[model samples]
Target: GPHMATPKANATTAKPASTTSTPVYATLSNAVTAGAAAPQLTTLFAAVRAANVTGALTANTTWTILAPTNDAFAKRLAKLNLTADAVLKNKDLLVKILSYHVIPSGAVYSKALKDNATVATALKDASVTVRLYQGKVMFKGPVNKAQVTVADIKAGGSVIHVINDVLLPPGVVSDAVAKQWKAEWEAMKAEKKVAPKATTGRRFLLF
Candidate 1:
């Protein structure tokens, strides 16, 4: 389904936090709900809640979200050998990882993104490199790189660019997280538990 009409989220640093506009399409929270335009964002929605960072996402503040789809999480899960339960159990660490996907500022549309540009993310530990390669937009993180698969999914003033991979901040995914993931994988193998399930996201083309 397409989006319902919602007021555009305006952030010009003038009398900010004022939603003095008419209510319209679903908010980001609404758009991410079941049967919304970007239903593939369910994994991200669940992750935000599990990390307790849903407040930042639902706030009136402007932000550019480099959202990773369910497929993205699935790939990362296999690559890192991690399970959904394992990730959700680490609240603080998950928050840090999720925050790395956000740019806590103006709406950065794909057209305005520059090539090889250094963009600051919400995470203080690292910044992202914007690359416009072969007419595709990519965000290169410390340990992982993601390409925007769905561009310009808007909800009011905020914008979402669904990416194909999770953006791992420097030292965030490695080191301690890696160690823990390995440990969990080992434990699961030893206990003969099942591996992380594949993402249930379906494939579709949006015009």
Candidate 2:
């Protein structure tokens, strides 16, 4: 239970209480709204819009969102080889990816995140592992793993936890959708390859 203390309570005093000290704030905004307010969660805010799941996460305040940071998306987006626009174009795929971060039950604080424990997510068959790695809260998703960068962000009746990596639940993307996205990536690469190269012209020195 002691491990569930606010994120940066004892780490440093430079940051604001919202991000460090405690989760004592009371705002009507849900996870999606509150996420947009956090500088580190800008990407997630955009994702909520793209996924069109604005009402789902907000409708019920019991859900806990493992919101990823912009850096997290940058690190994983390259691997997907799909542009954000492309990913959002697929409604089912987008919803799946976004929903993987939600837990339907009450908020789970870091103190309750036990080592070697598996936690189920909002997705039908998706589950994530919780572990205390090197004294930090770490989550092992179906495909990617991440450490909690900011924990216990209070929003409405839910909690938003910031993670360093995007959670990829196993088989979240269907085979058909995966193949389609791969095709799109390949097409874009081919298009770039055929582009004309810039010519380097020699510069004359003034005499």
Candidate 3:
């Protein structure tokens, strides 16, 4: 028990929380209003609007996010090459990056219930190995070590377990996405058969 995470205290067997009021926006805003305001969530809300998936993340989709907290932002800002202003400006990127962090799950909870071993992630990269050494818990991966700082805060579609630091997409994982995109691009180019020399400057290259 000492070596592994304990179940989230906030979570109980009661029915999940629901949105009572109807709003112009989607599911997340009401959830935010329901909970104790945390720093990253505002950013997350900004992002949800930008990505145009507020309803998706907060409703219909059952999911969980390993969120990072306030102090984590301070430490991570420079590393992410982001200022507070920049995050607000680049809302689209913020939303995708944040959405990518959440995965639909049945009953995902906080620092507790972890076996101090591997946990499967929805990222399709690899299953994250969760280990508890001393009081610290880590999700081992290629890029960032996603550590759990604050345990589960329940939301309608998912749970939020804020961490002490921002978790970046693992290096290998992001690179893989990039490479896959490049491959698709190159395939499109190949379909066009763009050549070094062509008499006709064709707008669209025919295969």
lDDT score, candidate 3, position 1: 44
Report the C-alpha lDDT of model 2 over 1-207, residue by residue, as the tens digit. Answer: 565655454432221123223346453243444556667877777767777666554323476777788999887776554466655566776777787877775677656778777788878888887888776778875355678887766566667788898877655444544455457567666643322222222333466
Clashes of 3: 4
Cα RMSD (angstroms) for every candidate in the order listed: 14.9, 16.3, 15.1
> Which residue pairs come into collision in candidate 2?
none
Across residues 1-207, which tens digit of lDDT does each residue of candidate 3 receive? Answer: 468666755622322344454322234444655432444555544454465554454455556656566556566554444345544556554654564466554444444546554555555554555676566666665445557775645455555566776554543133433344347567666554322221211133358
Clashing pairs in 3: 5-112, 5-113, 6-112, 117-130
The parts of candidate 3 lying over 4 Å away from their true place are 1-30, 35-40, 58-61, 83-92, 109-117, 133-137, 171-207
lDDT scores of the candidates, listed in order: 0.65, 0.65, 0.51
Per candidate, the number of residue pairs that clash is 7, 0, 4
Give the clashing pairs for model 1: 4-25, 5-24, 5-25, 6-24, 6-25, 9-156, 9-157
| Model 1, CA-based lDDT | 0.65
Q: Candidate 1 — which residues are off by over 4 angstroms?
A: 1-26, 34-39, 58-60, 109-111, 174-207
Error at 2, model 1, angstroms: 60
What shift in Å separates residue 10 of candidate 2 from its native position after superposition?
Answer: 46
